[PDB]
Design a protein around this ligand. Structure first.
Ligand SMILES: Nc1ncnc2c1ncn2[C@@H]1O[C@H](COP(=O)(O)OP(=O)(O)OP(=O)(O)O)[C@@H](O)[C@H]1O
Ligand SMILES: Nc1ncnc2c1ncn2[C@@H]1O[C@H](COP(=O)(O)OP(=O)(O)O)[C@@H](O)[C@H]1O
Ligand SMILES: Nc1ncnc2c1ncn2[C@@H]1O[C@H](COP(=O)(O)OP(=O)(O)O)[C@@H](O)[C@H]1O
Ligand SMILES: Nc1ncnc2c1ncn2[C@@H]1O[C@H](COP(=O)(O)OP(=O)(O)O)[C@@H](O)[C@H]1O
Lengths: 439, 443, 146, 36, 434, 434
């Protein structure tokens, strides 16, 4: 019933590369199907990413439009899991107005290296039974006070310090609030009121849902793991109180003197055992958009020991490298193309095309007759795969409009007449040719 | 009353319950296969299942693809976000093209998040710090509560309050006969000003006297608040909470769009999923509509590849009036509808057709009766014949100036002789281009 | 460890350039006329605002009847620089909490005869659900603006 | 408080600086300045 | 004697758009001459503008150089009058360095819609004569004077603080909005211009106010819809009205103002006066900006557009593509074209007579005859410039009415395009580049 | 003394009282037809009635276009604004192109504002403040010419108190501006301590009280800029003004509307008078098509200055049109709005007079046997090259211990510094080594 922020996208059915533990691709597994050569190869680079021993590695996934290049990349992003940073960038996105192209790549690189910090501290977690705050009549003006805390098992009294007092009164904690204090830092946090004070109260000074009193021992430890990437370590260090720039995107062109200092101090946090630097992946999707200026930065950024692995996708033949007249393979300059490994995808068979449409209907919660899958496979070979994929939704919606339980071949023949393939729209554009503009 | 626009008659797609198109309904006519296609797209959007699926309404100028894209907004109604754009909006000077697209993608997804508002308010008739019968040991006196005597046009009622409220009433300047409020969820007390009851007690005093509240001293309602995820992007990217030096400096400096990080998108998604799972926030995924899509740069089209495939994205409606144009931001590369073939592969294209002479006549009638105009049938037959020789837009546009001319000539309806005057006063693109070609050396 | 603390010789400006060479000083008698001919003079604001001739008539400063701003508040805010800007901002932050609880509960009847725009009716930025007064008033949204 | 011109129903707005009576308009100022 | 800041420019003479009640144009009136069909079309759109009933209508006034297209738009701006907005821009003014081509057009649209509002006021307005305060809480008494009356206010606690923080003294002139209590000094009374003999840099001397002292009245205001958008763009956004220091105003602000201003006309609180946006030289608009006008012409608070253009079948800016007027076909059918026509000798006389009537010049009828040939042979806008130079030559010569010889003298001094290009082609290799 | 410049010899058009040109006068020679045309333009600018009317000085490099535009500036003198700009100044990076034109159009319209500059200065003999707080401050001033007392307002006393003034300080007070400067302690107190960290100035040997009727010059652009952004507001004496650096900004056309409506309110009072001036858009061929197309509004507008363009380009491409050739590098649509003045290559005798006028301005004695050679070398090259040889030739003559040019000095300089056409031959020969 309820619908979350992430929904059925173009790749939502992909859940990994579908390799076995001997690294062979299965014919259909984890949502991926067919495409054996490129999935096998992506398995080797995925294992190289997860091994993490070597920096400055680049992979280009290449082949016809609609042949699983982005599927493999958005697929290994799932098999690598959420605990290790994978950054998806379209090659269009480095063209900033806050910063140069070589800055936007230096950020996309460094945002793809994690510094996994495990933080642990003692917390005090209890229902507040009372607060005493004492204030002198004028004098030097130093406040002093006490706090009493309770669990379902336990109780104690704390003679408070001065900095604790200003935090407790800033956060307006009151008797019957349940709170969780970081004993290492003096930060309060509030869970809500305990149920017990429905009997005696004032006219409402606060209102919320109630929460149960905390259980067990009053003092308990907490563990957090932060996957803070190098780019956000640079931003935090770029100026004092810089923290909002992590969200706001505000910092352009951070000083080299900051980065070369973070590259030293993160190495020290590795050697101290203070933080786990984890290499990630930068996926520069549609990389044929990079200017030759940006590619020449990729020649030499890609050779620091702080470089991530990077993966690229392209669907371009011999074409002019963007920003020049020079023709080259993939629209990538040979300076970079010599420096990387090329994984080449393959067009689909009937068997694979039908099997993609079959896993797609299983993600979309659609039933189709085997007759309907047959016609849709023919449509997805005569036209591109992405058109046939899209007709599944429209055919299920037309079927639901006639109150059908299963999509039939005549729902697909209907939808095929209703929404055009490019190759058919581009044909009708010949018979109305004078009416469309700027032919 | 309201003033009539180029689309004010479009009230919906006018479909049957079976999803077929009626000849003329909801202020549209004709285009039946494209109206039926938009019927499937309304179900696509109302299902809330899909993300980033996209359609391209493709057809000659004046054939109705902006009317159909707006008819979808009427079939959906105001409950879900429909976010209109032109391709030309991406060329901001403050923020990169691709982030303007990402902001417009994030505008087309709405939370519908609901909560209680509760406030205590009124003219304060007393503030009685109320003592215990005896002090505690070693103390001179103790206040167990303040009593505040709030009044409104419904009545007076005392509120018992925590003693700490006095150490905020004297941070304000609250005195008896002010009107004040207290946020019941937060316990902060705020002063509005002296009540209007006292506006006569000096010839001048330096405050705006505030009218006495009505309804009870204690007010409650639940309210439904609808915010796009782009409102959540902005309010986190540039906080408004004033009492920090960087909040004030950030509010005295010039406002700016800024290149919001994928991390803020991630963190907002990670909290709205908390509130969707807890049932506190509904979601209404909606529509991004881009008209004049052929104005996007090839970097923008190549950004739409990632954006449309993304599992978060809205349903996108593209519209284009172009033939085999060059893709903007490439020198020589001609491509159908002015869109790269590898974007044009990702979209369900809907063919929008030229009108027959009778459909133009039927549209001109529907314009006239919603533009507020009476036209004679012989003048309408002539105006449909003008339309057939020119465009739907020119023959529709002759209506209001023909009504002004009829009204100036003392008549309540457009006659034959009025339309042929306006047709001689005002030229169309087809007749004007002939004049420029005949006068070629003079412009 | 601590950063290298360099200090340079101060930039030497002669008594001559300090006395005669500052345009703020040697043109002060001319800079006065840039202020006397200013439309921000409270006399000209009042005369532009309330002493118009036309039954309908366009004039600037018409918005000062719908922002809270006084003619002398606008003059002081224009002629007394970024300090007067800052103080006028801090008081507008205060005033927004007073405006919001009016704006969100005073819904019935109307402001007078169900006509006339009231003072502050152009300050609309409080009506956004995510505006700081409303975000402080409603406790749930304060957690989405984290 | 009301205008001290005896026929006048209006509220007091200001007072005469010469005679000290409460007033509400120029017409009441002229009348009060006559009847003193 | 005295010279005003506004004086005799190229269109100054056309004080309107000469039309009978039936919209039949007069052969010459309100300064305009000839162009009968284009002036009927201009009159019909002028009544469409005065109605305000329908939105996003656009007229392209097109025709050869000198054929009155900006004249019709300026004569129409005068005939529409004040009290209904008429934003005029050259099409090259939208190319800002601090906001997009979308924004500069969106502001140019929004600045042509007038929200007309009623507001109810009382303001005190007078010279302060003296202030009395006691020393207990304080209850002061303060005297206001105006040319008609001398009056005293009993005043409250916060007022005494406000008057002493604003440092009022005897002989200051002040106003106070009574509904808000905000004081505002206007200056010091001219009757007081001597109780000091060196005075602060922002003192100003003003007349002692007159009429009633606490004026209670409604006043109408007209606010262009753009100002409501600017005021809501940032906290002190009104400073950016004057500074120009605003750009890229959020779409969520503009669509909030639309919903709010719609709510005010539904409540009857305010009415929307749709003005005109005139884009002279609209062929300077980029393809990325014409494609914005396409969706701009569809809001129920778009202005009526008027455009002028002066281009054959020509390349649209930012493209390889030829089109009529240098405007895309996908805009030109939303437009409704008005065509201006070259002048006859009969019309070229009357316009040169009307420019001489504006410039305060007498010419011999033979001088109008020779000048009319010069304007007919070279260009009208050249003959319109010779008449001033001929007046100055005639004044220097101690004449009074310009003779044929004064025209021939000026024509020997100041060249047109065609003679100057001939002399350039004779001396050619001395000029740089071609 | 002053520095000689590329035009410091031209002192006027040199026309006679009939308006015809003298052969050589006011530092100009030759060029009679263009000088007579500029005579009419000086009468046009002196007549004040016209707005936006414009002139193009057209003709080859080194033919006097900028000398005649500066001759117009000298015929008018400092009393009327002449604003020079290159067309290349339009390419700002803080504001749009079509704003820089409007700023410079607003610099060329002046206000003339008389005031009686009223200065008091001397040793302060006493400061005595007198309402119960400060009604006024009596100050006493002394000089070696006498004594006075002034009745200062409280805002001037705040300024004395900000200047940290005490009894016995020497002060300058200006009674119009309210400007105050402490100048030092009066040296009669220089023995008050043996070292104190103050400067002691002798008691002024001048009047306690001085008057001038000064006559201030200010331009509408000074008003636009000083009223658009919030002022710095404080006499330094602040640190908020450290944070926000200034920038040039797109001053809105709606502010300029109010500045015009305010200046009309002051020139009606006779407090100011208007001086319509000249904008000299030098090298106008360097404007872009968007700048040129904005002039098709700015030259029409009823407020605008007179505009003088200059160009030396042939039938070249219009800057920013990527293709379109047009005479003088200007669009035909603008070239149909300007009165063109031709400019001509001189005969050798007319160059020889300029060489002597340059020599006798530039401080050079020159013998006829060398002046004949500079006249000849002008015909072998260009006028500006011959003129440029004079100081070098005199400077070799001075090193050679001689009071004058003789043939061998100019002959040596000719063989030492090449002209633009003899050097082009060297580059055409050694083509493979550059
Ligand atoms: N009476 C004169 N007649 C013509 N030119 C003169 C005269 N007096 C001075 N000049 C010369 O003008 C020359 C420089 O300005 P000039 O107007 O010739 O520049 P230009 O090349 O024609 O135009 P521009 O300033 O656009 O480059 C100097 O050599 C100066 O001696
Ligand atoms: N091997 C695959 N397994 C599963 N789905 C695939 C596979 N190859 C392509 N698809 C699907 O086909 C569509 C287009 O493929 P995609 O990789 O996104 O295109 P492209 O190769 O141009 O980058 C997507 O919906 C994708 O999931
Ligand atoms: N099918 C339709 N039924 C009724 N009116 C229509 C229809 N299609 C177009 N219109 C009218 O004709 C106008 C032109 O269509 P529009 O969508 O604006 O053209 P375009 O396809 O080029 O964007 C619309 O604004 C509307 O007034
Ligand atoms: N019909 C007219 N009536 C009065 N003045 C006119 C008329 N036509 C042209 N003019 C005058 O001729 C000059 C140029 O006309 P204008 O409209 O500005 O030319 P264009 O259309 O090419 O831009 C101006 O002085 C203008 O007032």
């Amino acid at each position: 019933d309820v619908t979350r922020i992430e929904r059925i996208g173009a790749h939502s059915h992909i859940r990994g590369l579908g390799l076995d533990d001997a690294l062979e691709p299965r014919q259909a597994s984890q949502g991926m199907v067919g495409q054996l050569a490129a999935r096998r190869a992506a398995g080797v680079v995925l294992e190289m990413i997860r091994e993490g021993k070597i920096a400055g590695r680049a992979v280009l996934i290449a082949g016809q439009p609609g042949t699983g290049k982005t599927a493999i990349a958005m697929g290994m992003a799932q098999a690598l899991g959420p605990d290790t940073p994978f950054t998806a960038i379209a090659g269009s996105e480095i063209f900033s107005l806050e910063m140069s192209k070589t800055e936007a790549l230096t950020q996309a690189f460094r945002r793809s290296i994690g510094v996994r910090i495990k933080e642990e501290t003692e917390i005090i977690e209890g229902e507040v039974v009372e607060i005493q705050i004492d204030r002198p009549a004028t004098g030097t003006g130093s406040k002093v006070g006490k706090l009493t805390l309770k669990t379902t098992e336990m109780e104690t009294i704390y003679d408070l310090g001065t900095k604790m007092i200003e935090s407790l009164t800033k956060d307006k904690v009151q008797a019957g609030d349940v709170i969780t204090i970081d004993k290492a830092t003096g930060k309060i946090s509030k869970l809500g009121r305990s149920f017990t004070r429905a009997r005696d109260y004032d006219a409402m000074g606060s209102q919320t849902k109630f929460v149960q009193c905390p259980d067990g021992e009053l003092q308990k430890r907490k563990e957090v793991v932060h996957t803070v990437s190098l780019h956000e370590i640079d931003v935090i260090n770029s100026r004092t109180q810089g923290f909002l720039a992590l969200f706001s995107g505000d910092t352009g062109e951070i000083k080299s003197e900051v980065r070369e200092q973070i590259n030293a101090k993160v190495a020290e946090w590795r050697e101290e055992g203070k933080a786990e630097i984890i290499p990630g992946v930068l996926f520069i999707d549609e990389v044929h958009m990079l200017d030759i200026e940006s590619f020449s930065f990729l020649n030499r950024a890609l050779e620091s020991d702080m470089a991530p692995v990077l993966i690229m996708a392209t669907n371009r033949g011999i074409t002019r490298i963007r920003g020049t007249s020079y023709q080259s393979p993939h629209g990538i300059p040979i300076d970079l193309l010599d420096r990387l490994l090329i994984v080449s995808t393959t067009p689909y068979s009937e068997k694979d095309t039908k099997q993609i449409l079959r896993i797609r209907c299983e993600e979309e919660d659609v039933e189709m007759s085997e007759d309907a899958y047959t016609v849709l496979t023919r449509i997805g070979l005569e036209t591109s795969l992405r058109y046939a994929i899209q007709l599944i939704t429209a055919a299920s919606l037309v079927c639901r409009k006639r109150k059908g339980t299963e999509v039939q071949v005549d729902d697909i023949k209907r939808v095929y007449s209703l929404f055009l393939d490019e190759s058919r729209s581009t044909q009708y554009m010949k018979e109305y040719q004078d009416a469309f503009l700027f032919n | 009353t309201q003033r009539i626009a180029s689309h004010s008659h479009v009230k919906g797609l006018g479909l049957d319950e079976s999803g077929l198109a009626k000849q003329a309904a909801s202020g549209l006519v004709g285009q039946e296969n494209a109206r039926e296609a938009c019927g499937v797209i309304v179900e696509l959007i109302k299902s809330k299942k899909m993300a980033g699926r996209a359609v391209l309404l493709a057809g000659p100028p004046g054939t109705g693809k902006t009317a159909l894209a707006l008819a979808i907004a009427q079939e959906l109604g105001s409950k879900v976000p429909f976010c209109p754009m032109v391709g030309s909006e991406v060329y901001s000077t403050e923020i990169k093209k691709t982030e303007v697209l990402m902001e417009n993608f994030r505008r087309a997804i709405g939370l519908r998040i609901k909560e209680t508002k509760e406030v205590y308010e009124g003219e304060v008739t007393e503030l009685t710090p109320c003592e215990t019968e005896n002090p505690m040991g070693g103390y001179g006196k103790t206040i167990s509560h303040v009593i505040i005597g709030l009044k409104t046009a419904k009545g007076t009622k005392q509120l018992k309050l925590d003693p700490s409220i006095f150490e905020s009433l004297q941070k304000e300047r609250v005195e008896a006969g002010d009107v004040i409020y207290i946020e019941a969820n937060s316990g902060a007390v705020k002063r509005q000003g002296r009540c209007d009851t006292y506006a006569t007690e000096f010839d001048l005093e330096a405050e705006e006297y505030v009218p006495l509240p009505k309804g009870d001293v204690h007010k409650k309602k639940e309210i439904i608040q609808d915010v796009t995820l782009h409102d959540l992007d902005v309010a986190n990217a540039r906080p408004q909470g004033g009492q920090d030096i960087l909040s004030m400096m950030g509010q005295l400096m010039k406002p700016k769009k800024t290149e919001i990080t994928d991390k803020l998108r991630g963190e907002i998604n990670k909290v709205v999923n908390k509130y969707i799972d807890q049932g506190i926030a509904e979601l209404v995924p909606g529509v991004l509509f881009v008209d004049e899509v052929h104005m996007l740069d090839i970097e923008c089209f190549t950004y739409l590849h990632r954006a449309l495939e993304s599992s978060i994205a809205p349903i996108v409606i593209f519209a284009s009036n172009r033939g085999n144009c060059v893709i903007r931001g490439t020198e020589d590369i001609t491509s159908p509808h002015g869109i790269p073939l590898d974007l044009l592969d990702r979209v369900m294209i809907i063919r929008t057709m030229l009108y027959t002479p009778q459909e133009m006549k039927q549209i001109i009638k529907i314009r006239a009766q919603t533009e507020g105009i009476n036209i004679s049938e012989e003048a309408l037959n002539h105006l449909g014949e003008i339309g057939t020789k020119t465009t739907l837009r020119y023959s529709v546009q002759l209506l209001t100036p023909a009504n002004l001319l009829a009204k100036i000539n003392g008549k309540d309806s457009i006659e034959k002789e009025h339309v042929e005057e306006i047709s001689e006063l005002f030229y169309d693109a087809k007749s004007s281009a002939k004049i420029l070609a005949d006068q070629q050396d003079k412009y | 460890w601590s950063p290298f603390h360099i200090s340079l010789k101060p930039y030497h400006i002669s008594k001559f350039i300090y006395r005669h060479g500052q345009i703020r000083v040697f043109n002060h008698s001319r800079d006065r006329w840039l202020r006397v001919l200013s439309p921000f003079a409270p006399d000209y604001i009042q005369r532009s605002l309330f002493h118009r001739k036309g039954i309908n008539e366009e004039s600037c400063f018409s918005f000062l009847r719908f922002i809270d701003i006084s003619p002398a508040e606008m003059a002081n805010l224009m002629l007394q620089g970024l300090l007067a800007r800052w103080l006028a901002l801090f008081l507008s932050l205060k005033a927004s909490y007073r405006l919001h609880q009016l704006r969100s509960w005073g819904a019935p009847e109307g402001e007078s005869h169900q006509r006339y725009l009231r003072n502050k009716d152009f300050l609309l930025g409080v009506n956004f659900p995510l505006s700081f007064p409303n975000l402080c008033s409603c406790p749930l949204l304060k957690s989405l603006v984290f | 408080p009301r205008c001290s011109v005896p026929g006048c129903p209006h509220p007091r707005r200001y007072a005469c600086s010469r005679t000290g009576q409460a007033l509400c308009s120029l017409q009441c100022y002229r009348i009060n300045l006559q009847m003193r």
